[PDB]
């Protein structure tokens, strides 16, 4: 298991391509019927930043939960005493790209709980192994992970 390099993404294709996470289906807003498809992840082994104080970071698709929960296990196995951390889940802040998978609960930005940047390349490798459809070492401060839409699986 080798860490991802800075700015590396796996698989080595664009996020929205068929081999990776696939196309953006459309923004999910709070006042929408599709908002009801999102449920909060309440995993005790995951830290949610929730700087918004809204619980938005917990909201994600079922497939996102499944891969994130597997990742929570491997993180603790890799570094005893450390946990998976989520800085961004579903987003309504507009704090991502124009057509971000965050806007429909298909992406998370993650760190370790100790916010040790030196662990993030390996964290990214763990996210690949946990089954995320696309993983990108997007900034010095976080790893972006995403999944296929529910109706693509």
């Amino acid at each position, epitope marked *: 298991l080798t860490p991802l390099a800075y700015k590396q993404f796996i698989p080595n294709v664009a996020e929205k391509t068929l081999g990776a996470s696939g196309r953006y289906e459309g923004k999910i807003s709070r006042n929408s019927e599709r908002f009801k498809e999102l449920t909060p992840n309440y995993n005790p082994d995951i830290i949610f930043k929730d*700087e918004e104080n809204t619980g938005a970071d917990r909201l994600m698709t079922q497939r996102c939960k499944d891969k994130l929960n597997a990742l929570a296990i491997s993180v603790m196995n890799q570094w005893p005493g450390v946990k998976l951390r989520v800085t961004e889940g579903w987003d309504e802040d*507009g*704090h991502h*790209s124009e057509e971000s998978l965050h806007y429909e609960g298909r992406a998370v930005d993650i*760190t370790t709980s100790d*916010r*040790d940047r030196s662990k993030y390349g390996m964290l990214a490798r763990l996210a690949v192994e946990a089954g995320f459809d696309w993983v990108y070492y997007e*900034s010095k*401060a*976080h790893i972006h992970c995403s999944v296929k839409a529910e109706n693509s699986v």
Partner: antibody
Amino acid sequence: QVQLQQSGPELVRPGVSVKISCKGSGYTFIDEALHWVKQSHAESLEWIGVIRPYSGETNYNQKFKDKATMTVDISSSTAYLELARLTSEDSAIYYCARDWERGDFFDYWGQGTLVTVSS
Amino acid sequence: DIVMTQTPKFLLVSAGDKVTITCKASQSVSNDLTWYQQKPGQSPKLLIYYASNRYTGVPDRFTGSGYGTDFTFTISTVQAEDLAVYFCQQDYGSPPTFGGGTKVEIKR
């Protein structure tokens, strides 16, 4: 409402040190990194360093390693920048600025502190 | 350290005209490029990050593009309130470094 409030302008004699402060409000202070940036007019913006209140970790620009010391007081939500052995080169505006855990770039800035080095 | 060379140093523009500012890195900075706006007597304000993402609240008239070494900041139709010094900044390499600024002045 996120705010970084800096201490007022300073007149300091050459060779002496100056300590300037930056108080954060409207967010959980311990939770975000705080950076210091110098602005003159001839070298406009220069990154001095960063302190991470949550870990106590500091990283300095090598250009400022001998000059600057960054500290925090978590109980009062205040970061401090101490610049030692001041010369004319040190007269400038100094900002504190917060990152938002997306990389080393800054969403909220303090109002700046003007330091004038003079006898 | 990575040097960011920003051009032009100054622009004089009528409200409604296009503004194009260029930032060139001495070596690749991937997409780790930020643009700030600094209005007279104010602290810098974040406008664009990751080379092309508009920050929240930032008007549609402001865009960024580029990847690697060549970056462009555009105001499509400049407004009277956009008078400011604009700066690029990279954070790919350590330390983070800024361009020298472009002063946008308004003709009327």
